[PDB]
């Protein structure tokens, strides 16, 4: 079975560098591109940039460009992500996966943990949080500053992340349903709105909802919407 396994965490001081590691099995690793995600709880995810295995060729978003080294062992199956200089703003947790919606496929994520005592398109989530009883309604709300549609297709997904569990793919393309999800998630939209619908709400459905546009570069997601069950 195809796994990305990395890491859980790394303790680090400010002004260090830190590598991170992805190693892949189950699958061959010079063939598809892998991606690097950060996490934060206030910016949701953000795309840091990618890389082709195969030869070494990388993409960087613009705002990481400094910040992050892509490199891949193909002896070993292992993809690296060096962050340098580090400091407080890149505690966070940084995913390596592959992120088009037919491959979907995500690494456990790795806690980075900075420790010192003393035009792109922006998602826009509505809500950030909610509540809902079991067996009632949850819709969440995901808002594009430019189209994300091309040639009568959204280049949009859903993301789910449940409590402890890595990211998976929901939704793809704005309202066709992964294989695996059950039927009462459903997803709607075009152009800049869309809307995700789950109803009826089981417990199983509590965790954090992010949605994602792949229709420009950079890639972009939304801030997360976090669901619990109301008891
Ligand atoms: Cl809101
Ligand atoms: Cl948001
Ligand atoms: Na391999
Ligand atoms: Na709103």
């Known amino acids: 079975q195809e796994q990305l396994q990395q890491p859980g965490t790394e303790l680090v001081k400010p002004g260090a560098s830190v590598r991170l590691s992805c190693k892949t099995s189950?699958?061959?690793?010079?063939?598809?591109?892998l991606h690097w995600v950060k996490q934060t709880p206030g910016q949701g995810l953000d795309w840091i940039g990618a890389?082709?295995?195969?030869?070494?060729?990388?993409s960087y978003n613009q705002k990481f460009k400094d910040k992050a080294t892509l490199t891949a062992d193909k002896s070993s199956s292992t993809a690296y992500m060096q962050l340098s200089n580090l400091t407080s703003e890149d505690s966070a947790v940084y995913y390596c996966?592959?992120?088009?919606?037919?491959?979907?496929?995500w690494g456990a994520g790795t806690t980075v943990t900075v420790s010192a005592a003393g035009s792109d398109i922006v998602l826009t989530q509505s809500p950030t949080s909610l509540a809902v009883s079991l067996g009632q309604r949850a819709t969440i709300s995901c808002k594009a500053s430019?189209?994300?549609?091309?040639?009568?297709?959204?280049?949009m997904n859903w993301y789910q992340q449940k409590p402890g569990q890595p990211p998976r793919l929901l939704i793809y393309?704005?309202?066709n349903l992964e294989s695996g999800i059950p039927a009462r998630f459903s997803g709607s939209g075009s152009g800049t709105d869309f809307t995700l619908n789950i109803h009826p709400v089981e417990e199983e459905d509590a965790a954090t909802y992010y949605c994602?546009?792949?229709?420009?570069?950079?890639?972009?997601f939304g801030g997360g919407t976090k669901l619990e069950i109301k008891l």
């Open positions: 189950g699958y061959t690793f010079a063939s598809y591109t």
């Open positions: 393309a704005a309202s």
């Open positions: 996966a592959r992120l088009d919606w037919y491959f979907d496929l």
């Open positions: 994602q546009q792949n229709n420009e570069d950079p890639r972009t």
């Open positions: 890389i082709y295995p195969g030869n070494g060729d990388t």
């Open positions: 430019q189209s994300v549609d091309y040639d009568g297709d959204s280049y």
